[PDB]
Design an enzyme around this catalytic site. Sequence first.
Site, mmCIF file in Angstrom:
data_model
loop_
_atom_site.group_PDB
_atom_site.id
_atom_site.type_symbol
_atom_site.label_atom_id
_atom_site.label_comp_id
_atom_site.label_asym_id
_atom_site.label_seq_id
_atom_site.Cartn_x
_atom_site.Cartn_y
_atom_site.Cartn_z
ATOM 1 N N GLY A 1 1.295 -0.540 0.198
ATOM 2 C CA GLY A 1 -0.229 -0.093 0.047
ATOM 3 C C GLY A 1 0.878 1.287 -0.172
ATOM 4 O O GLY A 1 0.641 2.595 -0.389
ATOM 5 N N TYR B 1 -9.494 0.444 -3.811
ATOM 6 C CA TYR B 1 -10.146 0.371 -3.110
ATOM 7 C C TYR B 1 -11.757 0.497 -3.849
ATOM 8 O O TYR B 1 -12.080 1.456 -4.924
ATOM 9 C CB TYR B 1 -10.130 1.869 -2.660
ATOM 10 N N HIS C 1 -6.334 12.187 7.478
ATOM 11 C CA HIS C 1 -4.694 11.782 8.210
ATOM 12 C C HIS C 1 -4.299 12.581 7.156
ATOM 13 O O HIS C 1 -4.394 13.554 6.039
ATOM 14 C CB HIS C 1 -4.334 9.614 8.282
ATOM 15 N N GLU D 1 -0.028 10.709 4.891
ATOM 16 C CA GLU D 1 0.417 9.312 4.594
ATOM 17 C C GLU D 1 1.272 8.915 6.023
ATOM 18 O O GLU D 1 1.702 9.487 6.532
ATOM 19 C CB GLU D 1 1.051 9.557 3.122
ATOM 20 N N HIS E 1 -6.549 15.664 4.937
ATOM 21 C CA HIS E 1 -7.670 14.979 4.686
ATOM 22 C C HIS E 1 -8.195 13.833 4.810
ATOM 23 O O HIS E 1 -7.997 12.245 5.993
ATOM 24 C CB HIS E 1 -6.564 14.430 2.904
ATOM 25 N N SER F 1 -4.418 4.064 -5.448
ATOM 26 C CA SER F 1 -3.541 4.243 -4.994
ATOM 27 C C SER F 1 -2.020 3.762 -4.017
ATOM 28 O O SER F 1 -1.911 2.645 -4.168
ATOM 29 C CB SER F 1 -3.992 4.794 -3.536
HETATM 30 O O1 LIG Z 1 -9.348 6.622 -1.246
HETATM 31 C C1 LIG Z 1 -9.334 6.788 -0.658
HETATM 32 O O2 LIG Z 1 -10.490 5.435 0.423
HETATM 33 C C2 LIG Z 1 -8.390 6.651 0.130
HETATM 34 C C3 LIG Z 1 -7.486 7.739 -0.484
HETATM 35 C C4 LIG Z 1 -6.257 7.862 0.554
HETATM 36 O O3 LIG Z 1 -6.401 8.615 1.530
HETATM 37 C C5 LIG Z 1 -5.010 8.591 -0.549
HETATM 38 O O4 LIG Z 1 -4.676 10.116 -0.152
HETATM 39 O O5 LIG Z 1 -4.972 8.644 -1.954
HETATM 40 NI NI NI Z 2 -4.301 9.533 2.671
#
Ligand SMILES: O=C(O)CC[C@H](O)C(=O)O
Ligand code: NI
Lengths: 348, 12
Positions: free
Chosen positions: A163, A170, A181, A183, A269, A281
Site C-alpha cells: 500500500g 479501493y 490523516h 500519509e 485529508h 493508490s
Molecule cells: O480513497 C480512499 O479511500 C483513500 C485515499 C487515500 O487517502 C489517498 O491519499 O489516496
Molecule cells: Ni491518504
Amino acid sequence: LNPSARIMTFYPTMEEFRNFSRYIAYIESQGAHRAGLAKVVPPKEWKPRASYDDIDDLVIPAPIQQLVTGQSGLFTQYNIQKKAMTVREFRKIANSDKYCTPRYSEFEELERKYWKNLTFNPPIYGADVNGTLYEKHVDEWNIGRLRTILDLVEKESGITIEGVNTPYLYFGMWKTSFAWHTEDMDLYSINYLHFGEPKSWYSVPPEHGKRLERLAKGFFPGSAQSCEAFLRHKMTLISPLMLKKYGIPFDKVTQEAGEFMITFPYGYHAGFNHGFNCAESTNFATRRWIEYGKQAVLCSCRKDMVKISMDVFVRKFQPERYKLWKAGKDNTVIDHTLPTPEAAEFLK
Amino acid sequence: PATGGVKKPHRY
Ligand SMILES: O=C(O)CC[C@H](O)C(=O)O
Ligand code: NI
Ligand SMILES: [Zn+2]
C-alpha cells in the site's frame, strides 16, 4: 504562487504527462502543494486500461463494514471485517436499493446527506486490496511503478510495505469514508479513480496541519493521551462545519472517474464516495519529502504500523548533515511554502 | 526491524 492555498487542478499534455516526478515538481512550482491536495486531469489520449469489464471475479479478501458513532460533527469509525467477496458481489450490494446513492440535485445536497446519515446504515468498503488495474504496458503515471526516490526502500533494504510502495485498490459505495490523516511517514500519495461515481475530498493546508492536530487532541482527550499520533489510526471523522467553526482553514474538491488526485507531505485529508467506484493508490516521494519523513510524528501504540528508516535518504541526499543527524542534533525546521528542489527548472 | 509494516490499518 497560490496565496489562497486553494486546491488547484492541472491539465498536462502527453509530453508533460510522461515524466512523473518532473510534473510533480512543476505543479509544486505553481504552489499546488500549499493546499495539501491537488487534482491532475490526464490528457484525453491517455488510458491506463482498455476496459474494466474483465474484473468481476476479482476477489476483495477483507471487506469492512464502516460503523460510526458520534455527534455534533465529531465521529469515530470502527471498521468491521466481513467475509471475502468478488467485485461482482460487491457491485450488486453497492447498487442495491439499500446502499445506493440517494437522489440529489447538487453536490452540496449530497454532502449534507452524507454528514446527516453517516452513522446510519453502515456501508461496506472494499478497501486496501492488494493489486492494480493498470495494464503492464502503460508507462505514464503507472501507480505500480512511478520510479521516485521512494524505491530506495525496496531497492536497498529489500523491504515491501504494501500500500505504501505497492498498489492498493479501493472499491467504494455510497457513504463509505476515509478518515482524516496524512500519509505514513508523511509521504506523498497518488489516487486515480478508475471508474464509477465520484469521490469527494476535504484537505487542510500543510502549514495549518498542527492546528487540526490540536483541535483533534482537544476533541479526543483519551485517544490523545494513549497515542500522540492517534489520527494515524484512521478512525477520526470531522465535519467541515466543525472545521470552519474552530477556524481550521480547509478546502473541498470532487474527483471524477479518470482524474488523478495528489496529496502532499503533511497534507491532511478525508472524504467519501458518492457511489460504486474503484480507485488505485500508493505513496511516493521527492527530495522535498525527506525532511518531513525525518520529523514525522509516528504511532507506536500499535504493531504493523508503517515505519521507514530515514537513514538511506539522509545519507544519500543529505551527506553533509548525516553525522549531525545520526547524533540527533539536526535542528532543521520545515517551510511548507517551498517547492521541491527539482522545481528550480521551472522557477527561472 | 527498522523498516516495514503495511498501510492497511488494523481491522475489527
Ligand atoms: O480513497 C480512499 O479511500 C483513500 C485515499 C487515500 O487517502 C489517498 O491519499 O489516496
Ligand atoms: Ni491518504
Ligand atoms: Zn497509535
